């Protein structure tokens, strides 16, 4: 029933005799599935996300240098060394400086000089491996039974999926069950893609591009920084000193490069859940196990009333809320005719076999009237409810496709 609350909607029609239908679920869109003698089924794609992706790399874009040591030796007296060269948390550079009289060397020429600095990564970008199989996606399912809007959330069955999760059953008490075989289709190939994270912001990036970044990177589980020299600046050496400086924060450059990349929404509650954008889900739905409640109910013959007058949904359909004070349990007779005399239903009833199980029940009914002038008729006799309607013929937000038969 919740498709009514959703702007972008599509109607799947099942052919009498078929048991399966095919539906394409896009994000922020809803699909109403209708089959003869079957209750209509609203299905919608809530979220498509990846949960707990293994961290492949970390890429430091802001480094901090501390404790700079520099050693040197006069020409032809041997190479100069530091203990830090053996220390893995140190970025070092070996080079030579001009030496001679004036800096305490008896020989004029290139003398050895080495600089080491303690490397600490202030800020790094995380890179996650996205597993095709660990990809999760959630689908909301609901029926058109006559529930008030205020109750929709409690009637919605939530179907959780992952890649190769198997078919998921949606069981509705009194109306049977529907079965969903879904296959998730992502916009991005994950064989050549990382999930990049900087601060709160996330993106989908290319693996080769990320590996080719001239920046210090750390392996999974960490404990070692490779290519520190990318964020360390060694100025041309003086006789016995070298100015070593940490490079500017490369946050800006990184963001700039990331402007040309798709973005990912990190889940608010969970720090490990990453919601994907634009993906769609191809679903195959079995309806043969769905049934209708109140098929045995006698038709409502008592005076009913409109709690909510027939109102346009924006989908080209009409919703009304009908109160049944007496006669329950009973079937609510609903048709959409050409006039007040004819009794041929020209409208399409979304709420198949509307019933009122108890007295003073308020049943929400949706129906698709034909174009132009028609009359909505609820119940029969002189106490019946009538409401003149007109359908503009203008374009509506709802999409209709060809009815389908699948064995």
């Amino acid at each position: 029933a919740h498709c009514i609350g959703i702007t972008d909607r599509d109607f799947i029609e099942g052919v009498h005799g078929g048991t399966w239908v095919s539906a394409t679920l896009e994000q922020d869109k809803c699909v109403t599935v209708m089959a003869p003698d079957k209750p209509s089924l609203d299905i919608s794609l809530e979220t498509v996300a990846i949960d707990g992706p293994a961290e492949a790399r970390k890429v430091c874009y802001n480094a901090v240098l501390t404790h700079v040591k520099i050693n040197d030796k006069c020409p032809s007296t041997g190479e100069a060394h530091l203990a830090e060269e053996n220390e893995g948390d140190n970025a070092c550079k070996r080079t030579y400086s001009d030496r001679g009289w004036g800096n305490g060397c008896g020989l004029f020429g290139k003398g050895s000089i080495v600089a080491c600095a303690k490397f600490t990564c202030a800020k790094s970008m995380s890179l996650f491996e996205v597993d095709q199989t660990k990809i999760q996606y959630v689908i909301r399912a609901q029926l058109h039974v006559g529930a008030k809007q205020e109750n929709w959330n409690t009637d919605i069955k939530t179907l959780k999926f992952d890649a190769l999760s198997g078919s998921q059953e949606a069981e509705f008490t009194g109306y049977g069950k529907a079965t969903l075989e879904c296959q998730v289709q992502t916009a991005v190939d994950f064989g050549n893609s990382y999930i990049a994270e900087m601060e709160k912001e996330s993106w989908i990036v290319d693996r080769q591009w990320a590996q080719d970044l001239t920046l210090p990177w750390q392996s999974g589980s960490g404990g070692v920084w490779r290519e520190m020299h990318h964020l360390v600046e060694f100025e041309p050496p003086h006789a016995a000193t070298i100015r070593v400086l940490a490079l500017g924060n490369q946050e800006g450059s990184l963001k700039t490069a990331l402007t040309g990349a798709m973005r990912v929404t990190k889940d608010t509650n969970d720090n490990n859940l990453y919601k994907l954008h634009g993906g769609h889900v191809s679903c195959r739905v079995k309806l043969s196990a769905l049934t209708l409640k109140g098929t045995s109910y006698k038709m409502c013959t008592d005076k009913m009333s409109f709690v909510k007058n027939p109102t346009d949904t924006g989908h080209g359909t009409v919703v009304m809320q009908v109160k049944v004070p007496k006669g329950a349990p009973c079937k609510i007779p609903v048709i959409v005719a050409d006039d007040l005399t004819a009794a041929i239903n020209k409208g399409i009833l979304v709420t198949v076999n509307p019933i009122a199980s108890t007295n003073d029940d308020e049943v929400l009914i949706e129906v698709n009237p034909p174009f132009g002038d028609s009359y909505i008729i609820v119940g029969t006799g002189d106490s019946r409810l009538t409401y003149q309607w007109h359908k503009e013929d203008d374009d509506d937000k709802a999409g209709w496709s060809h009815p389908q038969f699948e064995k």
Binding site: L65, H67, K69, G100, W101, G102, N103, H238, A240
Partner: protein
Amino acid sequence: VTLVRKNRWLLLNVTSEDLGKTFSVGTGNCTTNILEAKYWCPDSMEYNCPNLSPREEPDDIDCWCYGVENVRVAYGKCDS
């Protein structure tokens, strides 16, 4: 300034208060002209101070010693 004996090396630990100062070390002396130097912090620098001959004028160095061997200067760039 503080001067400490560390293994083979003699450590000239200077601050901004020691700018341009010459100190009598043993039988010789040592001098530093390091604008960069302020007070001690992890953001530090440590390197050699060349032992120069009696008439050897400093060249491309901001720290040196006359008659003193194995001296290294160390300083911080942080403010107290």
